[PDB]
């Protein structure tokens, strides 16, 4: 008691704010803007109750602005049949949005995903200022004895929008790890409502590796210098690269997404972060995806530190650490060195540039390298992933590409002419396609 008593009585605050999912979402207004955490921080009990509210016809024209979708939202508020009531304003297209978009196309070209072109690293400002969010919902770790929850596997734009939204509703889950980070700790006085739902976090499914990943993982590993400061994506290929780096020492992490491969390097003592200029001694990420083993390991880990995406994905921030290595996958590379990492839904849905922040930052890092990698073929070797020209907006502009890698080798494109690029890229294609690519290159007057 005494001054600040409102702040201090946390058990009383908790009891005032604790409620059911149904009541927590009952006050969200038709016509308003809502956002939520990324991937595993999408709150399932709240989203189910919100979807049920829409099914009953008790809310309409609700815009949901979000990124990095999980099945959690995918099977509740974003279900196709609710699309006239809960309007997806996706700032990032994933498999969930592609399934919606395809369904809309079949239904006479119905527009069902309202795509919001945006720079990933600008998402917090975009959401808080340009767009405006009225309600924010996020899964959190349990309240500690000082009255704080943690955003856990999230930081991204969530740490800002949790404060800028008029109403912040949390879903307490003991399976959510308690994570240290910039603005990752949320005091109970900053929360408007609480529901409790203790269930395992959603997992990124573990994908079977393809044979090509073995050579690629070794080519990539040989380009990782001593003291490297790593960023990588998710999937079997990144995990394999981390596997080859198991014998290294004094590596750092400053990554968009924290994944199981990177966390394994932390566990093994490979990653020390002692050579980083920023956040020395700590692994930095803006959100985390993985499986239960990883999520449990993150709990109360003192050498892991989440940061908001406008810091993590700022190329100027990224480049202040020496020997940055950025490792990104792509789906296609063309003979000019442009890369395309998105599945084809036509031209209407362009890249977020989240990977491109690290292509840029890595090249600017002193001793840094950006690596973009792909198997040279798909579909049982019948389709080339090296193609003459990418049609539609590319993910990595050819002026930005640094290193590219296939199972046949690596090449640094910086400073090479179109002709020099085409000749070198053709040699990274599978031999079955080199003749066809050479002819196309000639017809295009690239060579």
- In the chain, where the domains are located: 1-447
Structure tokens at 249: 């020492």
DSSP label at residue 250: S
125 class by beta-carbon count within 10 Å (0-12 exposed, 13-18 middle, 19+ buried): middle
**C-beta of residue 305 within 8 angstroms of C-beta of residue 360:** no
Q: How many CB atoms lie within 10 A of CB 107?
A: 10
Q: How many residues does the chain have?
A: 447
- 76 φ/ψ angles, rounded to the nearest 5 degrees: -120, -100
- Parallel, antiparallel, or unpaired for β 252-253 and 229-232? parallel
CA-nearest of 298, 309, 252 to 278 is 252
**C-beta of residue 138 within 8 angstroms of C-beta of residue 36:** yes
98 assigned ligand-binding residue: yes
CA-nearest of 155, 383, 363, 165 to 257 is 155
Experimental method for this entry? X-ray
Q: What is the four-CA torsion angle of 63, 69, 72, 75, rounded to 10 degrees?
A: 70
d(CA 33, CA 35): 7
d(CA 287, CA 121): 13
331 assigned ligand-binding residue: yes
**CA-based max dimension of the chain:** 82
Structure tokens at 344: 């084809």
434 assigned ligand-binding residue: no
236 assigned ligand-binding residue: yes
Of 256, 407, 427, 436, which residue is the catalytic one? Answer: 256
**C-beta of residue 231 within 8 angstroms of C-beta of residue 362:** yes
Structure tokens at 157: 């734009």
3-class secondary-structure state, position 95: helix
350 assigned ligand-binding residue: yes
| Residue that is written with structure tokens 């072109």 in the block | 117
Q: How far is CA 335 from CA 246, 401, 404, 427, 446, in A?
A: 34, 12, 11, 11, 8
Structure tokens at 298: 């993150």
The DSSP result for 362-426, as a single string, is: HHHSTT-EEEEE--SEETTTTEESEES---S--SB-TTT--EEEETTEEEE-TT--HHHHHHHHH
3-class secondary-structure state, position 124: helix
128 assigned ligand-binding residue: no
212 assigned ligand-binding residue: no
| Residue that is written with structure tokens 């955003």 in the block | 151
Structure tokens at 166: 């008029």
307 assigned ligand-binding residue: no
123 class by beta-carbon count within 10 Å (0-12 exposed, 13-18 middle, 19+ buried): buried
CA-nearest of 333, 397, 352, 313 to 94 is 352
**C-beta of residue 39 within 8 angstroms of C-beta of residue 192:** no
Structure tokens at 67: 């990124």
Resolution (A): 2.0
* Breaks in the chain listed by the residue before each, with C–N > 2.5 Å: none
**C-beta of residue 194 within 8 angstroms of C-beta of residue 14:** yes
d(CA 380, CA 437): 19
95 assigned ligand-binding residue: yes
- For residue 136, what are the contacts with CB-CB under 8 A and spacing of at least 6? 34, 35, 36, 158, 161, 162, 164, 165, 167, 168, 169
Q: What is the four-CA torsion angle of 78, 83, 89, 91, rounded to 10 degrees?
A: 50
CA-nearest of 159, 228, 218 to 187 is 159
Distance of CA 412 to the CA centre of its chain: 26
Distance of CA 328 to the CA centre of its chain: 12
- For residue 12, what are the contacts with CB-CB under 8 A and spacing of at least 6? none
- For residue 130, what are the contacts with CB-CB under 8 A and spacing of at least 6? none
**C-beta of residue 133 within 8 angstroms of C-beta of residue 162:** no
Q: Which residues pair with 404 in a beta bridge?
A: 372, 411
- For residue 435, what are the contacts with CB-CB under 8 A and spacing of at least 6? none
DSSP label at residue 349: S
Catalytic residue flag (residue 212): no
d(CA 424, CA 336): 10
420 assigned ligand-binding residue: no
248 assigned ligand-binding residue: no
431 class by beta-carbon count within 10 Å (0-12 exposed, 13-18 middle, 19+ buried): exposed
Q: How many CB atoms lie within 10 A of CB 159?
A: 25
d(CA 256, CA 240): 18
CA-nearest of 412, 424, 345 to 372 is 412
Q: How far is CA 348 from CA 98, 154, 332, 353, in A?
A: 12, 28, 18, 15
């Amino acid at each position: 008691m005494g001054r600040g008593s409102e702040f201090m009585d946390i058990r009383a605050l908790y009891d005032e704010k604790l409620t059911t999912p149904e009541e927590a979402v009952s006050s969200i207004a038709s016509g308003s803007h809502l956002s939520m955490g990324m991937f595993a921080a999408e709150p399932p009990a709240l989203l189910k109750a919100l979807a049920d509210r829409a099914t009953r016809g008790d809310i309409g024209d609700l815009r949901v602005y979000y990124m990095e979708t999980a099945k959690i939202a995918g099977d509740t508020i974003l279900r196709y049949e609710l699309n006239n009531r809960i309007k997806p304003y996706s700032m990032f297209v994933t498999a969930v949005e592609r399934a919606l978009i395809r369904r809309g196309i079949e239904d006479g070209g119905r527009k069902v995903v309202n795509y919001v072109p945006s720079n990933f690293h600008q998402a917090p400002r975009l959401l808080a200022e340009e767009i405006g969010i009225d309600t924010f919902m996020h899964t959190v770790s349990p309240m500690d004895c000082h009255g704080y929850f943690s955003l856990g596997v999230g930081n991204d734009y969530s740490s800002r929008i949790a404060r800028s939204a008029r109403r912040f509703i949390v879903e307490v889950n003991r399976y959510m790890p308690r994570v240290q980070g910039e603005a990752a700790a949320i005091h109970i006085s900053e929360v408007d409502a609480i529901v409790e739902n203790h269930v395992p976090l959603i997992e990124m499914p573990v994908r079977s590796a393809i044979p090509e990943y073995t050579s690629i993982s070794h080519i990539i590993a040989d380009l990782v210098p001593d003291g490297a400061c790593l960023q990588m994506g998710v999937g079997a290929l990144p995990n394999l690269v981390c596997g080859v780096l198991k014998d290294r020492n004094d590596l750092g992490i400053h990554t968009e997404v924290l994944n199981p491969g990177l966390v394994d390097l932390i566990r093994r003592g490979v990653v020390t972060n002692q050579r980083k200029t920023l956040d020395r001694g700590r692994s930095v990420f803006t959100f985390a995806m993985g499986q239960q083993e990883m999520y449990e390991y993150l709990n109360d880990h003192p050498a892991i530190f989440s940061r908001p995406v406008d810091y993590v994905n700022d190329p100027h921030i990224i480049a202040q650490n020496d020997n940055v290595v950025s490792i990104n996958a792509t789906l296609q590379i063309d003979l000019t060195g442009a890369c395309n990492s998105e599945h084809m839904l036509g031209h209407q849905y362009s890249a977020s540039g989240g990977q491109l922040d690290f292509v840029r930052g890595a090249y600017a890092s002193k001793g840094g390298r950006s690596i973009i990698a792909t198997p040279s073929t798909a579909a049982k070797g019948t389709v080339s992933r090296i193609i003459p020209r990418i049609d539609g907006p590319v993910t990595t502009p050819r002026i930005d590409t640094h290193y590219i890698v296939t199972e046949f080798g690596a090449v640094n494109l910086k400073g090479l002419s179109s002709t020099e690029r085409a000749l070198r890229i053709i040699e990274l294609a599978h031999p079955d396609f080199r003749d066809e690519l050479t002819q196309a290159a000639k017809k295009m007057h690239l060579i």
